[PDB]
A paper describes a structure:
We present here the structure of the Ctf19c determined by cryo-EM. The structure provides an overview of the inner kinetochore and the coordination of its various functions by showing how Ctf19c components are organized relative to each other, how this organization positions defined Cse4/CENP-A recognition elements, and how the Ctf19c supports regulated recruitment of outer kinetochore proteins that tether the chromosome to the microtubule tip.
We assembled the Ctf19c from individual parts (Ame1-Okp1, Ctf19-Mcm21, Nkp1-Nkp2, Chl4-Iml3, Ctf3-Mcm16-Mcm22, and Cnn1-Wip1) and purified the recombinant complex to homogeneity by size exclusion chromatography. We used these images to determine the structure of the Ctf19c to an overall resolution of ~4.2 Å. A twofold symmetry axis in the calculated density map related equivalent sides, which were separated by a central cavity. A refined map corresponding to a single Ctf19c protomer showed amino acid side chain density for much of the complex, guiding modeling of individual polypeptide chains and their interactions. For the Ctf3c and for parts of COMA that are not well-resolved, we fit the density with poly-alanine chains and numbered the residues according to their approximate positions. The structure shows that, rather than a network of binary interactions, the Ctf19c/CCAN is a defined complex in which subunits interdigitate. C-terminal parts of Okp1 Ame1, Nkp1 and Nkp2 form a parallel, four-chain, helical coil. The map also showed density corresponding to the β3-β4 loop, which extends into the Ctf19c central cavity and contacts the Ame1-Okp1 coiled-coil.
Residue numbers in the entry:
A (entry chain F): 162 to 224, 233 to 295, 323 to 386
B (entry chain I): 124 to 150, 170 to 277, 289 to 321
C (entry chain J): 2 to 78, 84 to 153
D (entry chain D): 125 to 173, 177 to 201, 210 to 272, 279 to 284, 297 to 317, 333 to 364
E (entry chain C): 153 to 187, 193 to 328, 337 to 359
F (entry chain B): -1 to 242
G (entry chain E): 16 to 42, 50 to 80, 84 to 167, 191 to 336, 374 to 454
H (entry chain G): 4 to 36, 40 to 121, 135 to 177, 187 to 204
Write the structure that this text describes.
Amino acid sequence: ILRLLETNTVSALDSVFEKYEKEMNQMTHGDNNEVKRIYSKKERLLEIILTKIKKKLRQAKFPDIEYIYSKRQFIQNRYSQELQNNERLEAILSREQNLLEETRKLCMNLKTNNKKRLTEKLIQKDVTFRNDSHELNLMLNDPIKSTADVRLDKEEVLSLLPSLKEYTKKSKELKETMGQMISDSHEEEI
Amino acid sequence: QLSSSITSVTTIDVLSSLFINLFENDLLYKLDLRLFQTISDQMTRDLKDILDINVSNNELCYQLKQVLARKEDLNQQIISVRNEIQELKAGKDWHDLQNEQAKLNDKVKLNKRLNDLTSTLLGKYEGDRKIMSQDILDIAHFVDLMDPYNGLLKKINKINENLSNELQ
Amino acid sequence: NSEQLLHNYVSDSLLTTLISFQEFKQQLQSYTSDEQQLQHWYELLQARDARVTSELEARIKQFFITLRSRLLRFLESSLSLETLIDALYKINDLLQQRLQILDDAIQEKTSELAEFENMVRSPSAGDNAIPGLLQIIQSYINLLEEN
Amino acid sequence: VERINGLTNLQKELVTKYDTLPLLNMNLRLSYLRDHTYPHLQVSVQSRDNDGIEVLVVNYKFCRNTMNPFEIQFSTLLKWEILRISTNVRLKAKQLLATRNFQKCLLSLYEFDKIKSKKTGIFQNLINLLKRKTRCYSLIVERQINFIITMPGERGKPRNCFLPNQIDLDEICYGLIKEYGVKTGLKEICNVCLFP
Amino acid sequence: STSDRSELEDYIVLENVYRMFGITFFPLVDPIDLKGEIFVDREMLGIRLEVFSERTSQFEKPHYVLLKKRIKSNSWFLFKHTIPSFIDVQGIFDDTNGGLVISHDDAYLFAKRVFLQLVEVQKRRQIFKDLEAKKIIHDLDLDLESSMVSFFVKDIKVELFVKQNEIVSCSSQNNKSKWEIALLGSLDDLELKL
Amino acid sequence: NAMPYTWKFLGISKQLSLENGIAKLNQLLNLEVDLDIQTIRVPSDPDGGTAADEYIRYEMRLDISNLDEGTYSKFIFLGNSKMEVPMFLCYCGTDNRNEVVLQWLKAEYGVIMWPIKFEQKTMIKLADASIVHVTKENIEQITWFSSKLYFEPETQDKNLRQFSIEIPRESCEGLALGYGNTMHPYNDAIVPYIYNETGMAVERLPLTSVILAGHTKIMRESIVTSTRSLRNRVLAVVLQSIQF
Amino acid sequence: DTLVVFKQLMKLPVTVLYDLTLSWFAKDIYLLTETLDLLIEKGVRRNVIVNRILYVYWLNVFQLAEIDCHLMISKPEKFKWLPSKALRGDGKPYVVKLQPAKFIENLQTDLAKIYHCHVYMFKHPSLPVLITRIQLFDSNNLGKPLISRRPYYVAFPLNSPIIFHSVDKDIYARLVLQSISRTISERETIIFKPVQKIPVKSIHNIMTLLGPSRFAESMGPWECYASANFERSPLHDYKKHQGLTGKKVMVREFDDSFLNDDENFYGKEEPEIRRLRLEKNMIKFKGSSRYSSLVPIEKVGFTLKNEINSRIITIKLKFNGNDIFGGLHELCDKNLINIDKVPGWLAGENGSFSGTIMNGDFQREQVAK
Amino acid sequence: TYNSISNFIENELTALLSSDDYLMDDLAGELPNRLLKAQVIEKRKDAMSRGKQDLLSKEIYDNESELRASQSQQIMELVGDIPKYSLGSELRNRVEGEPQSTSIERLIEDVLKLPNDLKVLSEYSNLRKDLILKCQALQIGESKLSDILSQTNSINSLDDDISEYFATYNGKLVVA
Amino acid sequence: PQLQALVRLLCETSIIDTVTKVYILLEIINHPVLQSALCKWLVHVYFLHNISSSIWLHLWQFSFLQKWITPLVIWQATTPVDVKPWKLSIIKRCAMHPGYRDAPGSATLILQRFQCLVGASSQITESIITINCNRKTLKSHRNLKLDAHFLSEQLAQNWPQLHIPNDVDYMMKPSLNSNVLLPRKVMSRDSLKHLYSSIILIKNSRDESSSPYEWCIWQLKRCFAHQIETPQEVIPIIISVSSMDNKLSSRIILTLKKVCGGILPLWKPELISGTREFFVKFMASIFMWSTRDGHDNNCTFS
């Protein structure tokens, strides 16, 4: 019973340290006591009776604590971090289910836009441009898609454009003076 | 099992109680008294604590394992959520928004501009009787560039063609 | 960490104090034997297997407290008009950037059409062009009229 | 079960075509070529030994136009000239051939012919309406819908933006040129001329 | 013989000029043809696809796009081809005339669309990999279609992203505003910056 | 391969009728076993020219307490004297009694034996012989199932190994009626069909094992079925196979 | 662990690649160059290089120090794939992509599973980058390290519609795919990769089969359009003999079908006609131990919905094998299948798509897993 | 039952003493070995023990408060339901400066501003407006270059109608 | 007395099972053990005629093999092992179906084995005695025609069959002349006959021939050495001389071995032709001798 005697020795020593704590507690709760040489001799007598009981227990050998704190705390900490991970993933599914019902609401709003284009076409009930625009070739123009109006551009027209349009009007009057000469060539073939 | 140390604790309690009877038979002894009953009850609840702590950890191990399976439900669940939130921007790319800007501008914006223009020129329905002028750089360029080269060479070779008519 | 705090609370600051509550009944009430009630406390509340009752309390109360935190999450789900004006200003600014880019490239197209052709076409003269044109035109018109 | 070689006569190889390659010459190459690229082409070879070569690009929709090249090597990387132009275009062709690269050039000259053709093909069946219609140089004479033919130095292939109570007309015509076809855009402009 | 061997050589030089025209068609038939009278019930246009370089001023590996007569009704839907799939064939195909492509001219402008779509890829690789790669010492590398392009200017690493010959991305306020530019401005701005 | 009745085949040198020494077999193995003897004039639909249809399938009917194919172990011995090899031996199951049966069959008659690793034309012929179901009117209707003509051509380097051809029952009737009418649907339609489609001369092919659906697994030499019997025209053509 | 890494590091060659690995693994280093110089000339005791560096300079930050094993067993081919398109809700694809923006999905999976690494790579004949991507997931036992469970790969080529991720079909596999869906979005664009053909083989013969190659459909009887092996350039007299080319008289007669299906006899022909049979085979399956394929297709299943007499005619046709179509000219050389009536779809031109053709209308059968 | 389960926990804790001296099971012979003074001492004990439930009422609210605070650090660290994206990188790091995409995303942030995330980074919005104004000056510079390049052509480049009409009519009448 | 007689043979052997198996099979005609069952095959031939043993072989084993049998080789090997060292009944009965399936779709590899069976079968030429020249000449002719017919490898197999059956039949005639009762007259007959057939074969094999050279050499030696060791064939001196115009064709050919054979034929001819008549046969023989001597005075270079 080697492990039995070892655990008994360790547990009795832990009880001896807690006995020292209890002896200090009784000394603090005592009238006037400061020697404790009787306490040390009592610890010696306890060790003597402990060895005698160890003889009696090794005779009747009829056939782990900080280890317990350690393994218990090991699995507690593992469980706690596992729980932290759980609420993290719970946070992320809460965020994305919030997002799922958001975009689901917006696709229902697109369905309301379907009913609204029915109503908005009901107020006034009255494709091959790709094939033609690449049959010939043409260009398109889009300074639009802005909710604020763009005819008030004359804020930021100021950079070079009014000077530009004045000089183009000057060139327009110059080409009018050049196109005076067409008076011969109006209807030379009509 | 722990019944052995339990029996040893019982024997230590009996002997410490005999010494307690001797001490309290003559009275000092308060310290020794609390010493050996602390020995006794500490030994008891410590052996009791370690054995049922073995039991408790041996079960909450597998309750932890159950919450690991709960984590697995989390991962499958967020796969499904992220999946559907992904292809829900596919049906929003789809026909809904497409027909929205395919008929919205069609029978709102352009028909707005058209009916505004018909309110203008139907409101002055006399256009063939009033103006017809819809009230330039391109005509400027093609006229002012067809004149000095093409007009000159066309005229001089047309007059030389008249010379070919005249001699021949 | 929260579960760590909660079992540390329930184990330490409750059950160790309950054991202290047990042992302070020998010391200062009287001088009697004062242990009979201690073993009857043992024998009676050995249905509180305190480790197991503490862990069951943890695996109840920590969980519904997290449910309560889920409840009290919801909080959101003046002077901003200046930045709203700044945003509308940048809206005009970039719409102007697009429109000015189109007008810039169109004017550049007019430039590349006009300047290069009119310069390198007649070998860079720009003399009195319409005068010579009308002169040869009147001469050719007189020749054709005589024809 | 014979084994002759094959340079011509469809029937023979059209039986004995167990491969899949380009078919072969006889004319069905060049018939597909000419008949599915409509204005024509002529040559003469002028070998050397490194090969000066001519061509006669018969541009052919109604009024002719042509061109002629210079030498190659047999490795096909040598240099090229223009030696005959028709005067329907004088200097816009030199805008083009200012640069090299005959692929783009020829295509434009080709698609440019198709552009002139479709320009006329729109103008005749808009003139067909027998109301107050009058005639202009290159646009219309009613109420001034012009449009350029740029043959630019940006993208290599000629693109044609349009022109049509001024800016209003601009965005309206840009709108209506997205629903009912270009061949009917004149019919639409007729509609805003006919009733109002 | 040599009686019409000159005639054949004339025809193939006519072919050579017709294929520097670029897009061409050319008949072929795959051996699915029942009946020496012989039916052909599936016909192939077959569109060879040829690009002119400048840097060598050659022609390349031509591409090839060959469609075929659909069984039911007089159509031309796609068959095997080869242009590398960073260019779509299928969508830009059936885009034209609703996928309902019958004549040869709509087929022609189909291949035209493919062609110039191919060729400005060739043009911008012909810009990068030649001109400032060799004039400027440059230590260049690039993508298959030239879109992440990164190099030394002479000194340092600059990435830029390209689109329809217009620069969008760049890798300083100096740097960024000098280079969100057009392609013809790119070589000029590397001339200027030094 | 989900059906029990395994029917390895065996040929006979010369015919000897059997009812003489059925006491001898019943003597040697001590177990009463019926020998049935019955004339059938297959082609029972007479489109075969009526040429020596004396077909007397001897049925060693091992009729004991039915606990196995080692208990029900029926044999069929089809004979025709006016054909050169006269007679073959089928046998079902997996019994150990069959060994001394055939051993005695060698012994008491003095006949010599060989198995039949039969071939492609064989497999196709009896394949569509399997689907003509026997009617009591003897004008026999045509069942249909779904073929799964597993091959296994080795080539060099195991490159091809194995390639199926599976036909839905619908398409079986399709190519039947489009032929049109026959009693030889496979060689009349289906192998002509797939020759005209995939150019696969399945006659010439290294076939290994046609499965027909839920009903047989014709193999390289060993027809397996899901019936305690073999159809008589099937037995006729497998006699026809080995002949000359 | 050390057994596993020894199974890996025995597959390696030695030459100087071990030297460069251990060089940056060691990031002493002055005279470590003179350790490794001698161990270059003592590059002899080949297998025990492993444990000696694995003990001298020796699962937390060590991951890149082992993942170069993947970097260099990319040398061989052994493992598998499967492809996946990249749609946008219209059938338009793209994968135009700047390289280093992979911290994005690094952080994005790090929001959802624990700290983690993935080297990128770059193959050096074939121009993808590939993402060896190890999911560090767990640590449990019922000891402080974490589990590197399953290196899932995503290789994508430059500028394709296609990526091909590796084949695991798991709740971590699909999770990483779900992440890499969204982290390549970047514009609130919509990616949602759907799947193609299920089986596969290795890298070169997946990208030349499909992706950003020029064989998008060029293979089968058509590789003379893949290569440009005729009609060279503007040249002159090569094209004259290219207009003076050979051929068999492989007559398309039905009587020829009687000659081929029926009418079996002896050799009775010179090596010319035997040659012409052989290149009928060759031109049918390639287009020119030589007798393999170009590309190992591994198993396919074709289908055939004819309609005949206004009535559907349906045969299915599954293959197996270790490379088919090379197997089929090695079958057809034996004059076992009668070559002129071999249509294209089982001539093998589609590149391993088990499609369901019907009256010449080959398809793909989308068929998600 | 936040502190109520613990309230029943401490109640069942003291109820051992309550049921013990209430039955007086050992207390019947303990006077031999507090008549009711023992139970008086017992509820003295339990009134002392209610300090623990005072600590419950403290620490439960402490825990819930700090977890609410952690939730506050979460919403401050993540985007507060703001999926806005390339500015959503731009406010944290430069990537490339795509004026196309920054322009277009700038055409989508101006939706319903007054009619979160750190007052929506008005400084980064001002930085983008400043950068766009810098580009606007960069474009206007080339506009001035075009103006000054076109102006040097106009100055350099810049009766007989009826006379030529009479001459052409005379040509018609003298040739036709 | 065969009950106790074969039991006495059991007293001289150790194989009771085969004894009782004779008294009641395919085990035996599959295979101490092997020689003992061989003696059982002999004993079955004794106690039978040849039926109950031989019928196994001479119908069913080759007539599997004409269709197919698996190993295909050990069966035919034992077949020849049985019938070759045994009865002319088995021999001629086998040879009937041999010539027939020869004229029918011959398998051209089994017919090699049947040719070996004939090659020992001086039993065959023995027991026929009536018109073997009919049967064997017809078989040789059919093989020649069909060899050219599946010729037009094709030509090499034509060479292989039409020469190998020839060599085997020549060995058969060699055995016939070893007996030579009336087999001498038939030996002259078939000897000149197959010599002529191989001569026309060499007319289809003039400048392209491989094996048939050895065949004609075999024929010539089978004339020559037989006539040298047996000078009793003076009525067959016509046959011994009869290689004249064929010998022109034979010296008309590398033919080193052919010339060696011709030298042997002519040398034994000049030896045993001194007893012949100096008018008709030996005049032609010495004429050939003079022609070959002129060929020798031409071989002094050529």
